[PDB]
Amino acid sequence: KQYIISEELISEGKWVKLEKTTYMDPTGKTRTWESVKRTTRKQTADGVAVIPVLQRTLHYECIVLVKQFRPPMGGYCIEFPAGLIDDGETPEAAALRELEEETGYKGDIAECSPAVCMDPGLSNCTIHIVTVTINGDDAENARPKPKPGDGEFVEVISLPKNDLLQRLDALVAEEHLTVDARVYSYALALKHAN
């Protein structure tokens, strides 16, 4: 019933652009929506986000997260490891690559979501959510080597999966951080399950 008629470029940067989208509403009435898009998409989605399950025997299972300064937020955020998919890269490969660069961990793919939207009222940004296990007892993950790209400055924070939401709330209460909505949602459902 609803569909895009046209788009009008308002402003284009190097990495983001702002458009005015004209669309048909289900009554037959024409309407406008201010939308953001990345300039970098060519493949399945803009980015991957990695749910990294760190498994060590005789230890609680942890979810590995990253803390970074985020210029659009003006502050530090706690997030799933993540990045944009390179031209000609698969989402699985992007996930394992980003996880290694941001955490130094080498993991195995468990599952891969379809393209899911980040903020569909605002942008067309999509990611693949990629669940990865990390065998923390394997020699390669003994002393994990984070390989930042130029301009990345990433702290690794591993939290127990069993208490994830309480631990995130605690970091927020002490550290003045912002938790990512996908991280929080996952933490919530861990608590809400069964």
Ligand X SMILES: CC(=O)N1CCC[C@@H](C(N)=O)C1
Give the one entry of Mg ion, ligand X, Cl ion, none that residue 33 binds, where binding means its C-beta sits below a cut-off of 5 to 8 angstroms depending on kind: ligand X
Q: Is 137 annotated as a binding residue?
A: no
How many chain residues touch ligand X (CB under 6 A)?
7
The answer on whether 84 is annotated among ligand-binding residues is: yes
Tokens of 192: 């809400």
By a kind-dependent CB cut-off of 5 to 8 A, residue 26 interacts, out of Mg ion, ligand X, Cl ion, none, with none
Answer yes or no: is 34 a known binding residue: yes
CA-atom Rg of the chain in angstroms: 19
33 assigned binding-site residue:
yes
Is residue 70 annotated as involved in ligand binding?
A: yes
Q: Does 25 bind ligand X (CB under 6 A)?
A: no
Kindly compute the dihedral angle of the four CA atoms of residues 20, 129, 91, 113, in this order, to the nearest 10 degrees.
-100
In the list Cl ion, Mg ion, ligand X, none, the entry touching 190 (Cβ below 5 to 8 angstroms by class) is none
8 binds ligand X (CB under 6 A): no
Gap between the Cα atoms of 94 and 92, Å rounded: 5
Residue 15 binds what, of ligand X, Cl ion, Mg ion, none (CB under 5 to 8 Å, by partner type)?
ligand X
DSSP 116-128: EES-TTTB--EEE
* Residues 34 and 20 sit within 8 Å (Cβ to Cβ): yes
Distances (CA, A) of 117 to 101, 126, 127, 129: 24, 4, 7, 10
Closest to a second copy by CB, 79 or 100: 79
What tokens does 156 get?
């690794």
Figure out which of the listed residues 7, 89, 92, 101 binds Mg ion, where binding follows CB under 5 A: 101
Secondary structure class of 73 (helix, strand, coil)? coil
Instruction: Count interface residues toward Cl ion (CB under 5 A).
Output: 2
Q: Which residues are annotated as a binding site?
A: 15, 33-34, 38, 70, 82, 84, 98, 102, 119, 152
Binding region for ligand X (CB under 6 A): 14-16, 33-34, 84, 121
